[PDB]
Structure 1
Protein backbone atom coordinates (compact mmCIF):
# COMPACT_ATOMS: atom_id res chain seq x y z
CA UNK A 1 0.00 0.00 0.00
CA UNK A 2 1.21 3.53 -0.97
CA UNK A 3 1.79 4.93 2.55
CA UNK A 4 2.87 2.27 5.12
CA UNK A 5 0.82 3.61 8.03
CA UNK A 6 -2.03 1.72 9.67
CA UNK A 7 -4.76 3.71 11.36
CA UNK A 8 -5.95 1.76 14.40
CA UNK A 9 -9.31 2.97 15.70
CA UNK A 10 -9.79 1.09 19.00
CA UNK A 11 -13.19 1.64 20.67
CA UNK A 12 -14.80 3.47 17.75
CA UNK A 13 -18.60 2.98 17.50
CA UNK A 14 -20.65 2.21 14.35
CA UNK A 15 -22.22 5.71 14.18
CA UNK A 16 -18.80 7.40 14.09
CA UNK A 17 -16.87 4.85 11.99
CA UNK A 18 -17.54 6.39 8.54
CA UNK A 19 -16.55 9.94 9.49
CA UNK A 20 -13.34 9.05 11.31
CA UNK A 21 -12.24 6.63 8.61
CA UNK A 22 -13.01 9.25 5.95
CA UNK A 23 -10.84 11.68 7.90
CA UNK A 24 -7.78 9.39 8.00
CA UNK A 25 -8.13 8.39 4.32
CA UNK A 26 -8.57 12.02 3.23
CA UNK A 27 -5.31 12.89 5.02
CA UNK A 28 -3.36 10.17 3.19
CA UNK A 29 -3.82 6.86 5.00
CA UNK A 30 -4.53 3.76 2.93
CA UNK A 31 -4.66 1.16 5.67
CA UNK A 32 -7.21 1.19 8.47
CA UNK A 33 -8.30 -1.39 10.98
CA UNK A 34 -10.88 -1.62 13.75
CA UNK A 35 -9.92 -3.77 16.77
CA UNK A 36 -12.43 -6.51 17.69
CA UNK A 37 -12.58 -5.17 21.24
CA UNK A 38 -14.38 -2.12 19.77
CA UNK A 39 -18.12 -1.99 20.48
CA UNK A 40 -20.33 -3.49 17.75
CA UNK A 41 -17.36 -4.05 15.41
CA UNK A 42 -19.51 -6.39 13.28
CA UNK A 43 -21.51 -3.29 12.33
CA UNK A 44 -18.60 -0.88 11.85
CA UNK A 45 -16.28 -3.13 9.83
CA UNK A 46 -18.61 -4.21 7.00
CA UNK A 47 -19.77 -0.56 6.74
CA UNK A 48 -16.19 0.69 6.22
CA UNK A 49 -15.37 -2.10 3.77
CA UNK A 50 -18.31 -0.96 1.71
CA UNK A 51 -17.68 2.79 1.88
CA UNK A 52 -13.86 2.67 1.70
CA UNK A 53 -12.74 -0.89 0.70
CA UNK A 54 -11.78 0.35 -2.76
CA UNK A 55 -9.99 3.45 -1.42
CA UNK A 56 -7.88 1.84 1.38
CA UNK A 57 -6.74 -1.46 2.88
CA UNK A 58 -9.59 -2.14 5.30
CA UNK A 59 -9.50 -4.63 8.13
CA UNK A 60 -9.55 -5.65 11.75
CA UNK A 61 -7.29 -5.76 14.78
CA UNK A 62 -7.08 -7.79 17.99
CA UNK A 63 -8.05 -10.89 16.01
CA UNK A 64 -7.57 -13.73 18.50
CA UNK A 65 -9.67 -16.65 17.24
CA UNK A 66 -9.73 -18.58 13.93
CA UNK A 67 -13.56 -18.22 13.78
CA UNK A 68 -13.24 -14.42 13.83
CA UNK A 69 -11.11 -14.60 10.67
CA UNK A 70 -13.95 -16.57 8.99
CA UNK A 71 -16.53 -13.96 10.00
CA UNK A 72 -14.26 -11.09 8.88
CA UNK A 73 -13.63 -12.69 5.47
CA UNK A 74 -17.35 -12.80 4.84
CA UNK A 75 -17.54 -9.10 5.86
CA UNK A 76 -14.94 -8.30 3.14
CA UNK A 77 -12.00 -7.65 5.50
CA UNK A 78 -8.72 -7.42 3.52
CA UNK A 79 -6.42 -6.96 6.48
CA UNK A 80 -5.87 -8.91 9.71
CA UNK A 81 -3.83 -7.32 12.54
CA UNK A 82 -3.19 -9.10 15.86
CA UNK A 83 -1.47 -8.37 19.17
CA UNK A 84 -0.04 -11.90 19.30
CA UNK A 85 1.22 -14.81 17.23
CA UNK A 86 -1.39 -17.55 16.86
CA UNK A 87 -0.41 -19.84 13.98
CA UNK A 88 -3.91 -20.88 12.81
CA UNK A 89 -5.19 -17.32 12.86
CA UNK A 90 -2.33 -16.35 10.57
CA UNK A 91 -2.68 -19.45 8.38
CA UNK A 92 -6.44 -18.99 8.10
CA UNK A 93 -6.21 -15.29 7.21
CA UNK A 94 -3.46 -16.05 4.65
CA UNK A 95 -5.78 -18.81 3.35
CA UNK A 96 -8.35 -16.14 2.43
CA UNK A 97 -5.74 -14.09 0.52
CA UNK A 98 -5.97 -11.42 3.22
CA UNK A 99 -3.00 -9.31 4.25
CA UNK A 100 -1.85 -10.37 7.73
CA UNK A 101 0.32 -8.26 10.03
CA UNK A 102 0.52 -10.24 13.23
CA UNK A 103 2.08 -9.04 16.51
CA UNK A 104 5.20 -10.53 18.04
CA UNK A 105 7.70 -9.29 20.59
CA UNK A 106 10.64 -11.71 20.41
CA UNK A 107 12.81 -13.34 17.75
CA UNK A 108 11.26 -16.77 18.47
CA UNK A 109 7.73 -15.40 18.04
CA UNK A 110 8.66 -13.63 14.77
CA UNK A 111 9.94 -16.85 13.16
CA UNK A 112 6.82 -18.69 14.26
CA UNK A 113 4.72 -16.02 12.51
CA UNK A 114 6.77 -16.31 9.32
CA UNK A 115 6.32 -20.12 9.37
CA UNK A 116 2.58 -19.55 9.57
CA UNK A 117 2.86 -17.56 6.31
CA UNK A 118 3.06 -13.98 7.60
CA UNK A 119 4.58 -11.62 5.00
CA UNK A 120 4.82 -8.68 7.43
CA UNK A 121 5.39 -8.33 11.21
CA UNK A 122 4.04 -6.03 13.92
CA UNK A 123 6.39 -5.47 16.86
CA UNK A 124 4.07 -4.90 19.77
CA UNK A 125 4.44 -2.97 22.00
CA UNK A 126 7.45 -1.31 20.33
CA UNK A 127 7.80 1.44 22.97
CA UNK A 128 9.21 -0.85 25.65
CA UNK A 129 11.86 -2.19 23.26
CA UNK A 130 12.81 0.86 21.19
CA UNK A 131 14.03 1.38 17.60
CA UNK A 132 17.28 -0.51 18.34
CA UNK A 133 15.30 -3.65 19.15
CA UNK A 134 13.90 -3.71 15.62
CA UNK A 135 17.36 -2.93 14.17
CA UNK A 136 18.62 -5.98 16.08
CA UNK A 137 15.72 -8.12 14.86
CA UNK A 138 16.25 -6.98 11.26
CA UNK A 139 19.77 -8.42 11.36
CA UNK A 140 18.24 -11.93 11.56
CA UNK A 141 14.89 -11.52 9.73
CA UNK A 142 14.64 -12.29 5.98
CA UNK A 143 15.39 -9.11 4.00
CA UNK A 144 11.92 -8.75 2.41
CA UNK A 145 9.87 -9.00 5.61
CA UNK A 146 8.22 -5.65 6.36
CA UNK A 147 8.38 -4.68 10.03
CA UNK A 148 5.81 -2.35 11.59
CA UNK A 149 6.34 -0.55 14.89
CA UNK A 150 3.13 -0.47 16.97
CA UNK A 151 2.91 0.94 20.49
CA UNK A 152 3.92 4.44 21.58
CA UNK A 153 4.71 5.69 18.06
CA UNK A 154 4.26 9.47 17.68
CA UNK A 155 4.60 11.91 14.76
CA UNK A 156 7.70 13.14 16.60
CA UNK A 157 9.43 9.74 16.99
CA UNK A 158 8.19 8.13 13.75
CA UNK A 159 11.46 9.14 12.07
CA UNK A 160 13.48 6.98 14.48
CA UNK A 161 11.39 3.87 13.77
CA UNK A 162 11.79 4.32 10.00
CA UNK A 163 15.57 4.90 10.50
CA UNK A 164 15.81 1.71 12.56
CA UNK A 165 14.40 -0.33 9.66
CA UNK A 166 10.62 -0.26 10.09
CA UNK A 167 8.74 -0.34 6.80
CA UNK A 168 5.98 1.54 8.63
CA UNK A 169 3.85 1.86 11.76
CA UNK A 170 0.48 1.08 13.26
CA UNK A 171 -0.92 4.06 15.15
CA UNK A 172 -3.44 3.63 17.95
CA UNK A 173 -4.13 5.89 20.93
CA UNK A 174 -1.83 8.64 19.57
CA UNK A 175 -4.02 8.84 16.48
CA UNK A 176 -7.46 7.86 17.82
CA UNK A 177 -8.77 7.48 21.34
CA UNK A 178 -12.43 6.45 21.80
CA UNK A 179 -14.61 9.57 21.96
CA UNK A 180 -12.31 12.16 20.38
CA UNK A 181 -13.68 14.49 17.67
CA UNK A 182 -13.51 13.84 13.90
CA UNK A 183 -11.48 17.06 13.76
CA UNK A 184 -8.88 15.54 16.16
CA UNK A 185 -8.65 12.44 13.93
CA UNK A 186 -8.02 14.60 10.84
CA UNK A 187 -5.39 16.60 12.83
CA UNK A 188 -3.45 13.58 14.13
CA UNK A 189 -3.65 11.79 10.74
CA UNK A 190 -2.31 14.91 9.00
CA UNK A 191 0.54 15.04 11.54
CA UNK A 192 1.54 11.40 10.97
CA UNK A 193 1.39 11.67 7.15
CA UNK A 194 3.52 14.85 7.36
CA UNK A 195 5.98 13.19 9.77
CA UNK A 196 6.27 10.11 7.50
CA UNK A 197 6.69 12.08 4.28
CA UNK A 198 8.93 14.69 5.89
CA UNK A 199 10.81 11.96 7.73
CA UNK A 200 10.87 9.72 4.67
CA UNK A 201 12.10 12.65 2.62
CA UNK A 202 14.85 13.30 5.14
CA UNK A 203 15.88 9.66 4.99
CA UNK A 204 15.96 9.75 1.19
CA UNK A 205 18.05 12.91 1.28
CA UNK A 206 20.43 11.25 3.72
CA UNK A 207 20.73 8.25 1.39
CA UNK A 208 21.43 10.56 -1.56
CA UNK A 209 24.04 12.35 0.51
CA UNK A 210 25.69 9.08 1.44
CA UNK A 211 25.73 7.98 -2.19
CA UNK A 212 27.38 11.27 -3.20
CA UNK A 213 29.75 11.11 -0.31
CA UNK A 214 31.63 7.88 -1.07
CA UNK A 215 32.26 8.77 -4.72
CA UNK A 216 34.80 11.21 -3.37
CA UNK A 217 36.54 8.61 -1.31
CA UNK A 218 37.01 6.34 -4.29
CA UNK A 219 38.46 9.13 -6.31
CA UNK A 220 40.65 10.27 -3.40
CA UNK A 221 42.02 6.77 -3.08
CA UNK A 222 42.50 6.60 -6.82
CA UNK A 223 44.66 9.69 -6.68
CA UNK A 224 46.54 8.64 -3.61
CA UNK A 225 47.48 5.42 -5.35
CA UNK A 226 48.50 7.19 -8.54
CA UNK A 227 50.81 9.44 -6.59
CA UNK A 228 52.50 6.44 -4.99
CA UNK A 229 52.98 5.11 -8.54
CA UNK A 230 54.46 8.45 -9.61
CA UNK A 231 56.72 8.54 -6.51
CA UNK A 232 58.35 5.27 -7.65
CA UNK A 233 59.25 7.01 -10.94
CA UNK A 234 60.83 9.85 -8.99
CA UNK A 235 57.87 12.28 -9.22
CA UNK A 236 56.55 13.91 -6.03
CA UNK A 237 53.47 16.04 -6.57
CA UNK A 238 52.49 18.94 -4.35
CA UNK A 239 49.49 17.57 -2.52
CA UNK A 240 47.76 20.85 -1.61
CA UNK A 241 47.78 21.98 -5.19
CA UNK A 242 46.19 18.75 -6.31
CA UNK A 243 43.31 19.32 -3.93
CA UNK A 244 43.15 22.98 -4.88
CA UNK A 245 42.63 21.99 -8.52
CA UNK A 246 39.81 19.67 -7.62
CA UNK A 247 38.12 22.34 -5.52
CA UNK A 248 38.59 25.23 -7.95
CA UNK A 249 37.30 23.32 -10.98
CA UNK A 250 34.39 21.93 -9.12
CA UNK A 251 33.52 25.49 -8.08
CA UNK A 252 34.01 26.79 -11.67
CA UNK A 253 37.08 28.79 -10.80
CA UNK A 254 39.99 26.72 -12.11
CA UNK A 255 43.05 28.86 -12.67
CA UNK A 256 43.70 26.75 -15.74
CA UNK A 257 41.55 26.61 -18.91
CA UNK A 258 40.32 23.25 -20.12
CA UNK A 259 42.84 23.44 -22.91
CA UNK A 260 45.63 24.17 -20.46
CA UNK A 261 44.64 21.31 -18.23
CA UNK A 262 44.77 18.99 -21.19
CA UNK A 263 48.09 20.09 -22.57
CA UNK A 264 49.62 20.03 -19.11
CA UNK A 265 48.52 16.43 -18.53
CA UNK A 266 49.98 15.47 -21.88
CA UNK A 267 53.23 17.15 -20.90
CA UNK A 268 53.12 15.34 -17.55
CA UNK A 269 52.89 12.06 -19.40
CA UNK A 270 56.08 12.93 -21.16
Structure 2
Protein backbone atom coordinates (compact mmCIF):
# COMPACT_ATOMS: atom_id res chain seq x y z
CA UNK A 1 0.00 0.00 0.00
CA UNK A 2 0.98 3.62 -0.52
CA UNK A 3 0.93 5.96 2.50
CA UNK A 4 -2.55 7.27 3.34
CA UNK A 5 -1.59 10.80 4.50
CA UNK A 6 -0.68 13.93 2.50
CA UNK A 7 2.85 14.03 3.93
CA UNK A 8 4.83 10.81 4.65
CA UNK A 9 6.75 12.19 7.65
CA UNK A 10 6.02 10.92 11.14
CA UNK A 11 6.62 13.35 14.00
CA UNK A 12 7.96 11.43 17.00
CA UNK A 13 7.61 13.28 20.33
CA UNK A 14 9.59 11.18 22.80
CA UNK A 15 9.25 12.21 26.47
CA UNK A 16 6.69 14.97 25.92
CA UNK A 17 4.42 15.78 28.91
CA UNK A 18 0.62 16.25 29.00
CA UNK A 19 1.01 20.00 29.76
CA UNK A 20 3.01 20.68 26.58
CA UNK A 21 1.47 18.14 24.19
CA UNK A 22 -1.11 20.39 22.52
CA UNK A 23 1.36 23.21 21.75
CA UNK A 24 4.10 20.99 20.22
CA UNK A 25 1.59 18.92 18.18
CA UNK A 26 -0.04 22.15 16.97
CA UNK A 27 3.44 23.36 15.89
CA UNK A 28 4.21 20.28 13.71
CA UNK A 29 0.71 20.35 12.19
CA UNK A 30 0.84 24.10 11.46
CA UNK A 31 4.01 23.28 9.45
CA UNK A 32 2.21 20.66 7.33
CA UNK A 33 2.63 17.42 9.32
CA UNK A 34 -0.36 15.09 9.41
CA UNK A 35 1.14 12.03 11.10
CA UNK A 36 2.23 12.13 14.76
CA UNK A 37 3.12 9.63 17.47
CA UNK A 38 3.89 9.62 21.19
CA UNK A 39 6.19 6.83 22.47
CA UNK A 40 4.92 4.80 25.45
CA UNK A 41 8.15 5.55 27.36
CA UNK A 42 6.89 9.16 27.58
CA UNK A 43 5.54 10.09 31.04
CA UNK A 44 1.72 9.98 31.35
CA UNK A 45 1.05 8.95 27.75
CA UNK A 46 -2.38 7.77 29.02
CA UNK A 47 -3.30 11.48 29.40
CA UNK A 48 -1.64 13.08 26.39
CA UNK A 49 -2.57 10.47 23.74
CA UNK A 50 -6.40 10.65 24.12
CA UNK A 51 -6.12 14.45 24.64
CA UNK A 52 -4.36 14.75 21.27
CA UNK A 53 -6.79 12.37 19.53
CA UNK A 54 -9.67 14.65 20.53
CA UNK A 55 -7.88 17.91 19.62
CA UNK A 56 -6.14 16.91 16.36
CA UNK A 57 -7.45 13.47 15.26
CA UNK A 58 -9.78 15.02 12.66
CA UNK A 59 -6.84 16.65 10.84
CA UNK A 60 -3.98 14.18 11.46
CA UNK A 61 -3.08 10.52 11.90
CA UNK A 62 -2.50 10.16 15.67
CA UNK A 63 -0.73 7.28 17.38
CA UNK A 64 1.74 5.62 19.70
CA UNK A 65 5.36 4.48 19.53
CA UNK A 66 7.44 1.94 21.50
CA UNK A 67 4.43 -0.44 21.53
CA UNK A 68 5.78 -3.79 22.78
CA UNK A 69 2.77 -5.76 24.13
CA UNK A 70 -0.66 -6.80 22.72
CA UNK A 71 -2.47 -5.46 25.83
CA UNK A 72 -0.99 -2.01 25.11
CA UNK A 73 -2.74 -2.13 21.71
CA UNK A 74 -6.06 -2.87 23.51
CA UNK A 75 -5.73 0.19 25.79
CA UNK A 76 -4.66 2.45 22.90
CA UNK A 77 -7.71 1.32 20.84
CA UNK A 78 -10.12 2.52 23.53
CA UNK A 79 -8.20 5.83 23.57
CA UNK A 80 -8.84 6.35 19.81
CA UNK A 81 -5.20 5.73 18.71
CA UNK A 82 -5.02 5.35 14.91
CA UNK A 83 -1.34 4.53 14.38
CA UNK A 84 1.06 1.99 15.92
CA UNK A 85 4.88 2.36 15.67
CA UNK A 86 7.38 -0.20 17.14
CA UNK A 87 11.13 -0.89 17.51
CA UNK A 88 10.77 -4.61 16.75
CA UNK A 89 8.69 -7.22 14.92
CA UNK A 90 6.12 -8.84 17.21
CA UNK A 91 3.53 -10.73 15.13
CA UNK A 92 0.66 -10.56 17.64
CA UNK A 93 1.08 -6.80 18.26
CA UNK A 94 0.81 -6.21 14.50
CA UNK A 95 -2.13 -8.61 14.14
CA UNK A 96 -4.16 -7.10 16.99
CA UNK A 97 -3.55 -3.52 15.77
CA UNK A 98 -4.49 -4.35 12.15
CA UNK A 99 -7.62 -5.97 13.67
CA UNK A 100 -8.62 -2.61 15.21
CA UNK A 101 -8.30 -0.98 11.75
CA UNK A 102 -5.10 0.82 12.83
CA UNK A 103 -2.21 1.79 10.56
CA UNK A 104 0.88 -0.17 11.69
CA UNK A 105 4.49 0.72 10.86
CA UNK A 106 6.69 -1.78 12.73
CA UNK A 107 10.49 -1.71 13.06
CA UNK A 108 12.80 -4.24 11.43
CA UNK A 109 16.47 -4.47 10.49
CA UNK A 110 16.66 -7.47 8.13
CA UNK A 111 14.94 -9.03 5.10
CA UNK A 112 13.75 -11.98 7.24
CA UNK A 113 12.15 -9.66 9.84
CA UNK A 114 10.56 -7.54 7.09
CA UNK A 115 8.81 -10.49 5.36
CA UNK A 116 7.61 -11.69 8.80
CA UNK A 117 6.08 -8.21 9.41
CA UNK A 118 4.20 -8.28 6.10
CA UNK A 119 2.67 -11.71 6.82
CA UNK A 120 1.28 -10.20 10.03
CA UNK A 121 -0.43 -7.61 7.79
CA UNK A 122 1.75 -4.53 8.33
CA UNK A 123 0.73 -1.83 5.83
CA UNK A 124 4.11 -0.06 6.10
CA UNK A 125 7.67 -0.83 7.32
CA UNK A 126 10.14 1.01 9.53
CA UNK A 127 13.86 0.32 8.99
CA UNK A 128 15.57 0.97 12.32
CA UNK A 129 18.16 2.16 13.03
CA UNK A 130 18.68 3.58 9.53
CA UNK A 131 21.84 5.71 10.05
CA UNK A 132 24.22 2.82 10.78
CA UNK A 133 22.88 1.00 7.72
CA UNK A 134 22.93 3.90 5.23
CA UNK A 135 20.71 4.41 2.11
CA UNK A 136 22.29 1.58 0.09
CA UNK A 137 21.04 -0.99 2.65
CA UNK A 138 17.49 0.34 2.15
CA UNK A 139 17.77 0.32 -1.66
CA UNK A 140 19.03 -3.30 -1.53
CA UNK A 141 15.94 -4.33 0.48
CA UNK A 142 13.47 -2.41 -1.73
CA UNK A 143 14.78 -4.42 -4.69
CA UNK A 144 13.43 -7.60 -3.09
CA UNK A 145 10.36 -6.41 -1.16
CA UNK A 146 7.03 -6.04 -3.04
CA UNK A 147 7.21 -2.92 -5.26
CA UNK A 148 4.39 -1.02 -3.50
CA UNK A 149 5.54 -1.37 0.12
CA UNK A 150 5.83 1.97 1.92
CA UNK A 151 9.25 2.05 3.64
CA UNK A 152 10.29 4.58 6.30
CA UNK A 153 13.77 5.50 7.49
CA UNK A 154 14.01 5.92 11.26
CA UNK A 155 17.16 6.70 13.19
CA UNK A 156 19.24 9.84 12.79
CA UNK A 157 17.34 11.33 9.85
CA UNK A 158 18.19 15.00 9.33
CA UNK A 159 16.93 17.76 6.98
CA UNK A 160 20.43 17.52 5.46
CA UNK A 161 20.44 13.74 4.88
CA UNK A 162 16.70 13.29 4.13
CA UNK A 163 17.17 13.53 0.34
CA UNK A 164 19.37 10.41 0.22
CA UNK A 165 16.70 8.27 1.92
CA UNK A 166 14.27 9.59 -0.72
CA UNK A 167 16.75 8.75 -3.51
CA UNK A 168 17.08 5.23 -2.04
CA UNK A 169 13.32 4.71 -2.47
CA UNK A 170 11.83 5.40 0.96
CA UNK A 171 8.23 6.58 1.05
CA UNK A 172 9.35 8.74 4.01
CA UNK A 173 10.91 8.89 7.47
CA UNK A 174 10.06 8.95 11.19
CA UNK A 175 11.67 11.95 12.91
CA UNK A 176 12.97 11.65 16.49
CA UNK A 177 15.46 13.72 18.48
CA UNK A 178 16.37 15.96 15.50
CA UNK A 179 12.76 17.12 15.53
CA UNK A 180 11.96 16.92 19.25
CA UNK A 181 14.01 16.41 22.41
CA UNK A 182 12.23 16.58 25.82
CA UNK A 183 12.23 20.11 27.26
CA UNK A 184 12.98 21.98 24.01
CA UNK A 185 10.85 25.08 23.29
CA UNK A 186 7.74 25.21 21.07
CA UNK A 187 9.69 27.59 18.78
CA UNK A 188 12.41 24.94 18.29
CA UNK A 189 9.72 22.39 17.31
CA UNK A 190 8.17 24.83 14.78
CA UNK A 191 11.66 25.66 13.38
CA UNK A 192 12.67 21.97 12.94
CA UNK A 193 9.33 20.90 11.45
CA UNK A 194 9.47 23.65 8.78
CA UNK A 195 13.01 22.59 7.84
CA UNK A 196 12.10 18.90 7.40
CA UNK A 197 8.99 19.75 5.31
CA UNK A 198 11.04 22.15 3.13
CA UNK A 199 13.76 19.49 2.59
CA UNK A 200 11.16 16.86 1.69
CA UNK A 201 9.51 19.09 -0.97
CA UNK A 202 12.97 19.72 -2.47
CA UNK A 203 13.87 15.99 -2.46
CA UNK A 204 10.60 14.87 -4.11
CA UNK A 205 10.96 17.50 -6.86
CA UNK A 206 14.48 16.18 -7.62
Smaller-chain TM-score bracket = over 0.9
| CA positional deviation for 1:165 | 0.5
Q: How far apart in 1 are the matches of 2:188 and 2:16? A: 14
Structure 1 unaligned residues grouped into runs of 5+: 200-268
Instruction: Specify the SS of the correspondent of 1:90.
Output: helix
Q: How far apart in 1 are the matches of 2:25 and 2:48? A: 10
Instruction: Specify the SS of the correspondent of 2:80.
Output: coil
| CA positional deviation for 1:40 | 0.3
4+ long deviations beyond 2 Å: none
Deviations 1:76-124 (A, max 9, x none): 0000000100000000000000000000000000010001000100001
Q: How far apart in 2 are the matches of 1:53 and 1:155? A: 26
Instruction: Specify the SS of the correspondent of 1:58.
Output: strand
Q: How far apart in 1 are the matches of 2:78 and 2:201? A: 35
Pick the structure with greater CA Rg: 1
| CA positional deviation for 1:198 | 1.4
Instruction: Specify the SS of the correspondent of 1:174.
Output: coil
Q: How far apart in 1 are the matches of 2:84 and 2:24? A: 20
Instruction: Specify the SS of the correspondent of 1:149.
Output: strand
Q: Which residue of 2 aligns with 1:139?
A: 143
Q: How far apart in 2 are the matches of 1:197 and 1:95? A: 34
Q: How far apart in 2 are the matches of 1:67 and 1:143? A: 33
TM-score normalised by length of structure 2: 0.96
Q: Does 1:194 align with 2:172?
A: no
Structure 2 unaligned residues grouped into runs of 5+: none
Deviations 1:165-214 (A, max 9, x none): 00000000000000000000000000000000111xxxxxxxxxxxxxxx
Q: CA RMSD in A?
A: 4.6
Q: How far apart in 2 are the matches of 1:104 and 1:154? A: 20
Q: Select the structure that is richer in strand.
A: 2
Task: Count matched residues.
Answer: 201
Q: How far apart in 2 are the matches of 1:156 and 1:61? A: 24
Q: Which residue of 2 aligns with 1:122?
A: 126
Q: How far apart in 2 are the matches of 1:60 and 1:54? A: 16
Q: Does 1:75 align with 2:50?
A: no
Q: How far apart in 2 are the matches of 1:71 and 1:159? A: 37
Instruction: Specify the SS of the correspondent of 1:80.
Output: strand
Deviations 1:37-79 (A, max 9, x none): 0000000100000000011000000000000000001000000
